[PDB]
Write a protein that binds this ligand. Structure first.
Ligand SMILES: [Cl-]
Ligand SMILES: [Zn+2]
Length: 255
């Protein structure tokens, strides 16, 4: 009811207290519904993120469409509604770059060109994808009002582990020429296991940003931790057949 509208300067303080590194690279998965209400809305949250990073920092967000039948255009193609209003708002602002493939990210800062430059990666989160360019630049991953099921960097860890499962997906690029690949996609619910893995090793910082429960982990810690669990169980992220997950049993089928 009478919830507090967070000011921009307050959000910067929360982000610094959470542990965001000024001048660093920060990949942010967000749900604005969790952070809301704020004064000045989603742009205010973006301005707070950019201010916490400072002029040397680079802010990165997912920015893909999800439409496998439609070609992607970095100038008009909207972000899928599942990534939130902040992601769909970030890429439209001035001087923020965007990848030129349907699995795009958006980045603004002195490092945006390096994180965005790569062509279409198959699977979408391969070692040649923006999520890997954040990892090689020692970036931070901010989970803003979302769980680890949205931690895209975990998908990169599956690919680096050479994970056995791979279901066929597809997309469209202009040369309507369908491009199918083998992706490691599932319900992603079991990604929440990484929460206990990381927090217990003291690798996950937790705190409030706005009204949201926020989690901040170094991208290298996400990959290194997950690679150890994947090295013990390549199917650690797969629901057992007992749980009867339709999205997970499909990945089990394709070896
Ligand atoms: Cl949202
Ligand atoms: Zn599942």
């Amino acid at each position: 009811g009478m919830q507090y509208e967070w000011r921009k300067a307050e959000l910067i303080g929360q982000l610094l207290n959470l542990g965001v590194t000024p001048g660093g690279v920060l990949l942010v998965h967000s749900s604005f519904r969790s952070v809301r209400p704020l004064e000045d809305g989603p742009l205010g949250l973006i301005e707070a993120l950019r201010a916490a990073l400072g002029p040397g920092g680079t802010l990165v967000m997912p920015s893909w469409s999800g439409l496998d039948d439609e070609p992607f255009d970095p100038a008009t193609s909207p972000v899928t509604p599942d990534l939130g209003v902040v992601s769909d708002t970030f890429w439209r602002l001035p001087n923020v770059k965007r990848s030129a493939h349907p699995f795009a990210f958006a980045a603004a800062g002195p490092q945006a060109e390096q994180i965005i430059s790569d062509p279409l990666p198959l699977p979408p989160h391969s070692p040649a994808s923006p999520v890997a360019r954040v990892h090689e630049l020692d970036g931070q991953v901010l989970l803003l009002g979302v769980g680890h099921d949205a931690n895209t960097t975990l998908h990169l860890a599956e690919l680096m582990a050479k994970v056995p499962y791979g279901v066929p997906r597809h997309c469209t690029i202009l040369q309507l020429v369908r491009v199918d690949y083998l992706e490691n996609d599932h319900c992603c619910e079991r990604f929440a296991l990484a929460d206990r893995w990381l927090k217990e090793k003291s690798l996950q910082k937790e705190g409030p940003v706005g009204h949201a429960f926020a989690r901040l982990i170094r991208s290298r810690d996400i990959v290194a931790t997950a690679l150890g669990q994947l090295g013990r169980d390549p199917l650690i992220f797969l629901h057992p057949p007992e749980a009867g997950c339709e999205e997970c049993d499909a990945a089990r089928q394709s070896i």
